[PDB]
Amino acid sequence: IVTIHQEPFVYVKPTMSDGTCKEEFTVNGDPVKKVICTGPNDTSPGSPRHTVPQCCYGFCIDLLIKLARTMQFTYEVHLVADGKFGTQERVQNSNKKEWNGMMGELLSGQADMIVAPLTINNERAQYIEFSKPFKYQGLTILVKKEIPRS
Amino acid sequence: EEAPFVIVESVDPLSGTCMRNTVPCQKRIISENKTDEEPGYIKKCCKGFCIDILKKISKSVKFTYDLYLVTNGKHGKKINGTWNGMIGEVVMKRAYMAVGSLTINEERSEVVDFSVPFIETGISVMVSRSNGTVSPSAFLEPFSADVWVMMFVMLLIVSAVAVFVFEYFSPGPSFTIGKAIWLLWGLVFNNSVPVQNPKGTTSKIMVSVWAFFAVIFLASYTANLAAFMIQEEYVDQVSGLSDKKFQRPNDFSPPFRFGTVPNGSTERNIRNNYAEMHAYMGKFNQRGVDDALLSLKTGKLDAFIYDAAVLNYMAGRDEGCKLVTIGSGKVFASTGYGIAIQKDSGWKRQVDLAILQLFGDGEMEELEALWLTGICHNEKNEVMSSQLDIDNMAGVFYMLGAAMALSLITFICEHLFYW
Amino acid sequence: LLWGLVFNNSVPVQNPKGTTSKIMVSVWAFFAVIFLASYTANLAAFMIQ
Amino acid sequence: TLDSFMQPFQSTLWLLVGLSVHVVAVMLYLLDRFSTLSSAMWFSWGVLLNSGIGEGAPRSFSARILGMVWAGFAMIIVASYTANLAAFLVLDRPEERITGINDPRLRNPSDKFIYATVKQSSVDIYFRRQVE
Amino acid sequence: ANLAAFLVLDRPEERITGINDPRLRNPSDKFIYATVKQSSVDIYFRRQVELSTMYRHMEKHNYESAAEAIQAVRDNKLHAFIWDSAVLEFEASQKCDLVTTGELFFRSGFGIGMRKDSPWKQQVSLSILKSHENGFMEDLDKTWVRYQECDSRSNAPATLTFENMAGVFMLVAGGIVAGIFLIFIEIAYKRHK
Ligand SMILES: N[C@@H](CCC(=O)O)C(=O)O
């Protein structure tokens, strides 16, 4: 399973020196269940081409754990080397067309499932199937408070 | 035949056909005399947002469709194991597709394949707008208590020190501290409390400075007093279907009336989760949407549980602003509508692609703005034409009574200490 | 006296005597306070356009 | 905008503020006597109507405190009254009227809104050419 | 009247609400707006033939990730940034220096991806449909997407602060020593007269 970095969905914190993550309780009083990822380096995989173990937890990780406990299967979560969602690379310069990023890695047979905030549209669903959505949202614009000090 | 997603139109009085942008509709009625036969020979007209979506799908997949109304059930519920209604008509090989306002749940999706959702739906309680009475202590709103204490101590110190020093230094009885503070008291509360005017040029200069300070303080004080003396601070009756008001209404306040209509998806969803709540609402079952709305408007009940979309539409496109939904856009068990397709079909992918293309084209937003706008759907207008009754500004009568009691107890203490 | 009364106040004057004179002064003061409450409604917006 | 001057305050509030001044003046006179009456009454009326009447102030400490509180109360009453009167004396108008022809008001013609034109004219021909 | 009129009428900014405003139709050099490259929002923006100039102005400079974009727009660099409603709402809830302004458009949920044919794809749909109406997703949303740390702006009229009180107090303090000096001058003049 390949996951993408998202501020409210998937958190990526460095592991401790022992080899695991620093277990910390939440405000409600329940122990947070977190898994370990094997994503790329911090800055970029270009110059420092080396993968380091990290920690993974959040909404997507919780849903993945729930599905794994419901269907009783095993998974190996790891981030994408491209670090992007993906697009349609139909450049005629190479006479070939193929997807890149997370979808490109999925279509290459490397992964089997995708637990990430992936939207639904015709171009992407024309090649892969999408189940029922678990959350609805839209598009908006984020601006500053502009500091009213008249 | 439901909320204006797909509506039935009567036959033309003289044309005998349907108007533009309308498709021929068929309705089979079996409520007449069944002595010989009566296969509902009635033809009407049908149109709406759902008809527009169906036309957009048909103009992209290039297929032909007929319209047939069901006369068995509303949407279809599991009764003794035999589905009756639109779901039963689809599963009994009597039809292939089913469009409208059908809800997608576990059982229906397990028995009938559904397409991708095209609109958001959910459970939301609709209650009457509860209005507040008044916010107490409104006359002290455009200021802070620390500011009041600072102003009081400044008044006292300035009066005492300035008047005493300038009367002793600079050359009718003497000007005591009582008249000294009384002069500044009259000066900041607008005027007229008859007061004993002082002598000396420097004392008059200080009085003029204090008068300027007082005329600045009144202009600063009635900046937004009227704006603060109008707020009501509306409070919602209940947070949702999770407190004890809906869980255990036995050992609580007088019986709160709340319920929903039977034979629906929300009824089964409540029965599966809340057994006691469903058993309590069984006695308060409604007999229609309009009847339940009229009962809620009269006062026989104070809570209605139904789909969020239709309730929001009825709250928006109503006479003025009568009722509003709790939470201002809350949805429980968020689901979506769709098009019921026969099991093991091939048109499901085509319908999904057509819906995705319509979503990516932007026509869905236009259709929503054309068919889902309401009157009270916008924000509330400005509150004007106020009355300011006794309860509105009675907060100063408490101060008056407290001051009267203070004067009485001080008079009693003085009479006791005089002896 | 009446001119000082509708002006807002403080031009210094001698108070009359008589109950009817005081009633007339009170009525004139009510008229004066009504006139200022109705005179400074939108003066700020009107002196800028 | 109503053509009156007692609109910002209700009749009950007017009656209450009219009854309060009398009992306050009576209490002031009683406290000044048992620890003059007409003078205190005229003082209580002048500190309420903002007039220039009023001979002198009482000498009792509690009476002085009560008079100061009543003067502050009358000041707050006058301030609230003028604020309420200025509140609905300006900036009172609807948002906007009909501006376009594609508004939902004309799309769904009801029985309350009646609009028509002259028959046998080009405007009717243009109006009958819109299929929507 | 002037003092009352200028300490009042603090109306909201009333920023851009719709996407079809003439500001975005004609992108100038002062207003800079962009999004994250290689995403579905760019594909949706490039499908509008009536916004070719807007799409060109957007694609003229695209960020690498959402983190860099939010870090740029936070430090008074970017003027407008378009993304999903949930992410921007969580960002406005965590950091109260940014406020989401606009109307929702192109509503599309988030679905789990899969291959072209697998029974697991059919089982996950039923599992989500079963677990989405049992309060599990609601509990997760209330636990992870419900903080409400900052305040609210339900009431537009606000009270006053300690701004002019210090000024008038300093004015009174200066008037005190001014009167002291005037009394001293008066005494000095009366001593010679
Ligand atoms: N009765 C409907 C829900 C209510 C409605 O759609 O009007 C159902 O079970 O799907």
B267 lines ligand 1 (CB under 6 A): no
Q: CA–CA separation, D125 vs D75, rounded Å? A: 68
- Residue the block writes with tokens 């499932």: A113
Q: For residue B318, say whether it is annotated as part of any ligand binding site.
A: no
Nearest 5°: phi and psi at B371? -120, 0
| C-beta atoms surrounding B362 within 10 Å | 15
- Ligand 1 centroid–CA B248 distance in Å is 26
Count how many pairs of residues, chain B against chain C, have C-beta atoms within 8 Å: 3
Q: State the maximum Cα–Cα separation within chain E, in Å, rounded to a whole number.
A: 114
CB B391 within 8 A of CB B134: yes
Q: CA–CA separation, C27 vs B386, rounded Å? A: 26
CB B271 within 8 A of CB B245: no
Q: CA–CA separation, A50 vs D59, rounded Å? A: 93
**Degrees to nearest 5, angle at CA B139 with B137 and B145:** 75
- B/e letters for B54-82, b = 16+ CB within 10 Å, e = fewer, are bebbeeeeeeeeebebbeebebbbeeeee
3-state helix, strand, coil split of chain E in percent (to 5) is 50, 10, 40
C-alpha pair distances (Å), D49 with each of C28, D54, D77, E91:
10, 11, 11, 57
- Residue the block writes with tokens 């081409």: A49
What residues of B are in contact with residue E129 (Cβ under 8 Å)? 104-106, 109
What residues of C are in contact with residue B192 (Cβ under 8 Å)? 9
Q: Determine the residue type at B286.
A: Q
Q: CA–CA separation, B8 vs B25, rounded Å? A: 8
**Cα dihedral E134/E138/E144/E148 (nearest 10):** -150
User: Shortest CA distance to B51 belongs to which of B115, B121, B2, B114?
Assistant: B2
Residue among A58, A87, A123 minimizing CB distance to E38: A87
What residues of E are in contact with residue C40 (Cβ under 8 Å)? 1
Q: Which residues in chain E belong to E strands, given as ranges?
A: 33-34, 80-84, 98-105
Non-local (6+) Cβ contacts of B348 within 8 A are: B113, B115, B341
| First-last CA distance in chain C | 36
Q: Which tokens in the block code for residue D55? A: 């001979």
Between chains, do C37 and D85 touch, taking CB under 8 Å as contact?
yes
Binding residues of D: 122
Give the gap in angstroms from C-alpha C44 to the nearest C-alpha of chain E.
Answer: 5
* Sign of the four-CA dihedral B189, B194, B196, B201: positive
Nearest 5°: phi and psi at B44? -130, -170
B342 lines ligand 1 (CB under 6 A): no
Q: Packing angle between helix B49-61 and helix B363-371, nearest 10 degrees?
A: 160
Q: CA–CA separation, B151 vs B72, rounded Å? A: 78
- Residue the block writes with tokens 């008509």: B89
Q: Which tokens in the block code for residue B396? A: 């100063």
Q: State the maximum Cα–Cα separation within chain D, in Å, rounded to a whole number.
A: 93
B167 lines ligand 1 (CB under 6 A): no
Alpha helix (H) residue ranges in B173-274: 177-188, 201-221, 225-228, 244-247, 265-273
Q: Which tokens in the block code for residue B158? A: 């300035």
Which protein residue has the closest C-alpha to ligand 1 atom 1? B264
Adjacent-strand bridge partners of E101:
A141
- Residue the block writes with tokens 């309009």: B290
Between chains, do B400 and D46 touch, taking CB under 8 Å as contact?
no
Q: CA–CA separation, B108 vs E19, rounded Å? A: 38
Would you call E164 an interface residue with chain A, using a CB distance cutoff of 8 Å? no
Q: CA nearest D23 in B: which residue?
A: B404
CB A116 within 8 A of CB A60: yes
Would you call B201 an interface residue with chain E, using a CB distance cutoff of 8 Å? yes
Q: CA–CA separation, B47 vs B9, rounded Å? A: 8
Q: CA–CA separation, B298 vs D35, rounded Å? A: 60
* Sign of the four-CA dihedral B275, B281, B285, B291: negative
Q: CA–CA separation, B125 vs B270, rounded Å? A: 13
Binding residues of A: 117, 119, 124
Q: CA–CA separation, E58 vs D103, rounded Å? A: 33
Q: Which tokens in the block code for residue D7? A: 């609109």
| DSSP reduced 3-state for B113 | strand
Q: Which tokens in the block code for residue B237? A: 């009756």
In this complex, the chains that touch B, judged by 3 or more CB pairs closer than 8 A, are A, C, D, E
Residues in chain C: 49
CB A121 within 8 A of CB E43: yes
Nearest 5°: phi and psi at B96? -115, -50
| C-beta atoms surrounding B120 within 10 Å | 15
Chains E and A physically touch (3 or more Cβ atom pairs below 8 Å) = yes
| C-beta atoms surrounding A30 within 10 Å | 9
Residues in chain E: 193
Q: CA–CA separation, A127 vs A122, rounded Å? A: 9
User: Shortest CA distance to B282 belongs to which of B248, B266, B259?
Assistant: B259
| C-beta atoms surrounding A21 within 10 Å | 19
CB E66 within 8 A of CB E83: yes
Give the gap in angstroms from C-alpha B160 to the nearest C-alpha of chain C.
Answer: 25
| DSSP reduced 3-state for B144 | coil
Non-local (6+) Cβ contacts of B372 within 8 A are: B49, B313
* Sign of the four-CA dihedral B171, B177, B181, B183: negative
Q: Residues 225-264, chain B: which have Cβ within 8 Å of A?
A: none
Entry resolution (Å): 3.8
| DSSP reduced 3-state for E52 | helix
Beta-carbon-side half-sphere exposure of residue A111 (alpha carbons within 13 Å): 22
Between chains, do B334 and A125 touch, taking CB under 8 Å as contact?
no
CB A89 within 8 A of CB A98: yes
- If phi > 0 it is left, if psi is from -120 to 50 it is alpha, else beta; for residue B272 that is alpha
Q: CA–CA separation, B249 vs B247, rounded Å? A: 6
Query: Probe ligand 1: pick from B2, B5, B50, B74, max atoms within 8 Å of CB?
Result: B74
Q: Which tokens in the block code for residue B336? A: 């979506």
C-alpha pair distances (Å), C31 with each of C3, C4, C12, C24, D45:
12, 13, 20, 10, 15
| DSSP reduced 3-state for C4 | helix
C-alpha E75: how far from chain center: 13
Q: CA–CA separation, E115 vs A107, rounded Å? A: 8
Q: CA–CA separation, B227 vs B145, rounded Å? A: 19
Q: Which of E165, E171, E184 is best to mutate for the B interface (most B CBs within 10 A)?
A: E165
In this complex, the chains that touch D, judged by 3 or more CB pairs closer than 8 A, are B, C
Give the gap in angstroms from C-alpha D93 to the nearest C-alpha of chain B.
Answer: 10
Between chains, do B353 and A122 touch, taking CB under 8 Å as contact?
yes
- B/e letters for E21-60, b = 16+ CB within 10 Å, e = fewer, are eeebeebeeeebbbbbbbbbbbbbbeeeeebeebbebbee
| DSSP reduced 3-state for B239 | coil
* Sign of the four-CA dihedral E20, E26, E32, E35: positive
Q: Which tokens in the block code for residue A106? A: 């999925």
Q: Which tokens in the block code for residue B7? A: 């509506």
Q: CA–CA separation, B362 vs E44, rounded Å? A: 9
User: Shortest CA distance to D81 belongs to which of B225, B1, B53?
Assistant: B225
Between chains, do B20 and D131 touch, taking CB under 8 Å as contact?
yes
Q: Packing angle between helix D37-49 and helix D11-33, nearest 10 degrees?
A: 140
User: Shortest CA distance to E39 belongs to which of E18, E61, E62?
Assistant: E62
Q: CA nearest A86 in E: which residue?
A: E38
Query: Probe ligand 1: pick from B266, B267, B337, B339, max atoms within 8 Å of CB?
Result: B266
What residues of C are in contact with residue E5 (Cβ under 8 Å)? 44-45
CB B196 within 8 A of CB B207: no
C-alpha pair distances (Å), E175 with each of B160, B168, B205, B210, E171:
15, 18, 9, 9, 6
Would you call C37 an interface residue with chain E, using a CB distance cutoff of 8 Å? no
- B/e letters for B377-400, b = 16+ CB within 10 Å, e = fewer, are eeeeeeeeeeebeeebbebbeebb
| DSSP reduced 3-state for E43 | helix
Q: CA–CA separation, B85 vs E72, rounded Å? A: 57
| DSSP reduced 3-state for B87 | helix
What residues of C are in contact with residue D51 (Cβ under 8 Å)? 5, 25-26, 28-29
Q: Which of E17, E124, E129, E193 is best to mutate for the B interface (most B CBs within 10 A)?
A: E129
Q: Which atom of ligand 1 is nearest to the CA of B77?
A: 9
What is the enclosing helix (H) or strand (E) of E142? helix E136-144
Q: Which tokens in the block code for residue A68? A: 């794994």
Adjacent-strand bridge partners of A114:
A2, E113
Residue among B143, B205, B273 minimizing CB distance to E182: B205
B75 lines ligand 1 (CB under 6 A): yes
C-alpha D19: how far from chain center: 20
User: Shortest CA distance to B58 belongs to which of B358, B365, B366, B362?
Assistant: B358
Q: CA nearest E168 in B: which residue?
A: B213
Q: Which tokens in the block code for residue C19? A: 């109950």
Non-local (6+) Cβ contacts of B74 within 8 A are: B85, B263, B264
Label residue B222 exposed, middle or buried (CB < 10 Å: 0-12, 13-18, 19+).
Answer: middle
CB A13 within 8 A of CB A55: yes
B264 lines ligand 1 (CB under 6 A): yes
What residues of D are in contact with residue C38 (Cβ under 8 Å)? 85, 89
Non-local (6+) Cβ contacts of B144 within 8 A are: E159, E160, E161, E162
What residues of C are in contact with residue E4 (Cβ under 8 Å)? 44
* Sign of the four-CA dihedral E149, E154, E156, E160: negative
